């Protein structure tokens, strides 16, 4: 708190909140976008609440393994931007449940997806961006959570009534360009302090704290040790955290909801002025989602090496007084090395643009809840829409997700054990999987009905939140005390569930589809992988996938050797791998 | 983070050495600690690079004479050579290597070996 209170910093601050009300107020006084500022965009998606917090936390607590989501979601994204973005422009639809209504029946499949969605929305998207945010101002200026939240919302209401949303390409990409250049000037400045990279190679292996000792209680050597056997990136399978197969996997199927079947991540690259400028924006974020590794990952244990006091707590009676949280709190790893090792010409720039980057995706996504339910549900309920009901009835209920949202933050700061990024992999695991294996049959199969997706769904679903219930009445529990759960169903692991949830839905909706009556081929001719040209019926802008035959040619060589250059970090970081001795 | 050595001294022509490399201070287990001598007047030469798995690379010169084994449970590594010639006097380094890419951190100290006839 002592670092930002100089004046100095503070100039900066109010100077780049002052630019970014300045460009707001120029858009609201003044879909042909370019590959930069799709680049940019889809790469600053997920960044300020599982980046910058949850990303080093883990990064903190374990090591180097949780920087192969970042190249998992590389994988996707690039799966994304040449398979799913033409068949989503094919069809000539927005987004996913859309897609589905033009595929499937009736309106039950596209109003579960809509309460599917505004449910993961509150989940992992809103309540974790407010409680980055909180941690953020907590961390900065001092004081308690619930005064630093409402100066968030504050802060936020001026953000989107300013009007900086509709001008979201120059925004994003300069704050994209700012905290990109100040992170590595960040972790410049974290490896020169350490003493080059081997003192960080041994410094961290003997990172323990000093209060390891509670009076009667004491806690076990493996509570504080920072897992000494795990350097290296692929885990044991069975008794390993982040276990190598389960990585790969449940990250795959969960990359492959977030970055295919988001409604805000495609409809933010369908706006494009050519199919070619999406893939090249594909690729410039595919080259920016490589960075993550050498850029968050290890000044998280820079903050270990360096704090080993407010980063790896065990003690709870003075961990709460550090922190704000009973158990482990790892979260702050990445804001107690931005407010300690930066000058302060910059200590203001990094909390400037790590919250106009959260600011950013707050605005998003309230518009696209506010969207997704008025226009899914509310439309769909009354069915008559007198417009300014329509209006007070989207204000009033973005303002019930605020209210919902920040009642469940008491959740969020102690679900798992005290990371972030284990909690919004937690949550995805259990409400995702199935509609990734819905979406997936229903592309691919082709002999899929209404009436085993929906059911296929249902069963995904009265699993996943009945493991969702059981974990979060109960929890994971300290390294001391063992969790109260049936372990059967409690603690195989979150990603190992991810991919029997996974196959469990597929094989359930396959089932049900091929025991009912079958989908006639007459109204199925543009979507669900087939290139006719004959006409369909079921219940200016980009309108083609085409392109020159050179710049096909130079997408598809950039492409692989974007795949090139990351299966040789993959197969660099696998290959040398340090193990200790006894 | 330092590689005691020892061993190292004077001996008439035909005779054995043994060198020792025992390192301290760290807590992985190093990789690649084989032996760099050093003549006078030119540069380091000769690899034995014992690797984790355990096994020998030396140089056509010094082959088969001398011989190179270390304990792979606790990072101490044995150059033991035979039949010194008057061509080895020469210091005689240590080095060590984290992982197999990252090119010989570590370096050692050195122990001098002057054989006569």
């Known amino acids: 708190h002592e670092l930002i209170r100089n004046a100095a910093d503070i100039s900066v601050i109010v100077i780049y909140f002052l630019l970014v009300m300045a460009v707001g107020l120029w858009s609201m006084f003044k879909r042909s976008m370019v590959w930069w500022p799709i680049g940019a965009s889809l790469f600053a998606s997920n960044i300020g609440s599982g980046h910058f917090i949850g990303l080093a936390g883990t990064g903190a607590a374990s090591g180097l393994a949780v920087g192969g989501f970042e190249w998992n979601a590389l994988v996707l994204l690039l799966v994304l931007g040449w398979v799913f973005v033409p068949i989503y422009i094919k069809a000539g639809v927005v987004t996913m449940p859309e897609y589905l209504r033009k595929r499937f029946g009736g309106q039950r499949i596209q109003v579960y997806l809509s309460v599917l969605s505004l449910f993961l929305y509150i989940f992992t998207k809103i309540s974790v961006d407010i409680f980055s945010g909180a941690i953020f101002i907590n961390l900065a200026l001092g004081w308690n959570l619930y005064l630093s939240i409402i100066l968030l919302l504050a802060i936020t209401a001026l953000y989107t009534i300013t009007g900086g949303l509709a001008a979201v390409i120059y925004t994003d990409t300069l704050q994209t360009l700012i905290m990109l250049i100040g992170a590595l000037i960040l972790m410049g400045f974290a490896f020169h302090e350490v003493g080059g990279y081997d003192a960080f190679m041994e410094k961290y292996m003997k990172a323990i704290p000093t209060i390891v000792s509670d009076g009667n209680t004491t806690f076990q050597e493996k509570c504080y040790t920072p897992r000494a056997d795990s350097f290296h990136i692929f885990r044991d399978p069975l008794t390993g955290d982040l276990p190598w197969p389960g990585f790969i996997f449940g990250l795959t199927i969960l990359a492959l909801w977030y970055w295919c079947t988001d409604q805000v991540i495609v409809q933010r690259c369908l706006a494009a002025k050519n199919m070619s400028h999406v893939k090249g924006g594909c690729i410039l974020a595919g080259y920016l989602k490589l960075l993550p590794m050498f850029i968050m990952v290890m000044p998280g244990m820079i903050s270990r090496i360096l704090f080993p006091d407010k980063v790896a707590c065990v003690v709870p009676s003075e961990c709460e007084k550090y922190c704000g949280t009973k158990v482990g709190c790892t979260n702050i790893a990445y804001p107690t090395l931005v407010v300690e090792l930066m000058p302060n010409g910059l200590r203001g720039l990094m909390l400037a643009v790590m919250l106009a980057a959260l600011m950013s995706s707050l605005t998003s996504i309230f518009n696209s809840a506010s969207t997704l339910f008025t226009m899914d549900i509310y439309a769909k309920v009354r069915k008559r829409a007198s417009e300014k009901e329509l209006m007070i009835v989207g204000r009033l209920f973005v303002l019930f997700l605020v209210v919902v949202s920040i009642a469940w933050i008491p959740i969020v700061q102690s679900a798992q054990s005290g990371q972030l990024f284990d909690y919004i992999q937690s949550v995805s695991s259990y409400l995702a999987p199935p509609v990734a294996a819905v979406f997936l049959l229903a592309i691919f199969w082709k002999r899929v009905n209404e009436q085993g997706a929906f059911w296929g769904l249902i069963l995904g679903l009265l699993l996943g939140l009945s493991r969702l219930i059981l974990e979060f009445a109960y929890g994971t529990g300290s390294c001391m005390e063992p969790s109260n759960c049936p372990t059967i169903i409690c603690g195989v692991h979150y990603l190992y569930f991810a991919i029997i949830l996974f196959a469990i839905s597929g094989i359930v909706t396959v089932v049900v589809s091929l025991l009912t009556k079958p989908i006639p081929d007459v109204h199925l001719y543009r979507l669900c992988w087939s290139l006719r040209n004959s006409k369909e019926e079921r219940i200016m802008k980009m309108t083609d996938t085409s392109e020159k035959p050179l710049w096909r040619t130079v997408l598809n060589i950039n492409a692989i050797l974007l795949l090139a250059v990351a299966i040789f970090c993959w197969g660099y970081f696998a290959s040398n791998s340090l193990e200790v001795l006894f | 983070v330092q590689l005691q050595e020892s061993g190292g001294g004077l001996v008439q022509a035909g005779g054995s050495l043994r060198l020792s490399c025992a390192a301290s201070?760290?807590?992985?287990?190093?990789?690649?600690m084989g032996w760099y001598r050093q003549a006078p007047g030119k540069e380091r030469e000769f690899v034995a690079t014992?690797?984790?798995?355990?096994?020998?690379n030396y140089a056509d010169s010094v082959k088969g004479r001398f011989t190179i084994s270390r304990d792979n449970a606790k990072n101490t590594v044995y150059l033991q050579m035979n039949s010194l010639k008057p061509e080895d006097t020469a210091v005689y380094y240590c080095?060590?290597?984290?992982?197999?890419?990252?090119?010989?951190?570590?370096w050692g100290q050195g122990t001098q070996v002057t054989v006569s006839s």
């Open positions: 201070g760290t807590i992985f287990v190093f990789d690649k």
């Open positions: 080095a060590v290597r984290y992982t197999p890419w990252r090119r010989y951190s570590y």
């Open positions: 014992i690797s984790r798995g355990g096994s020998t």
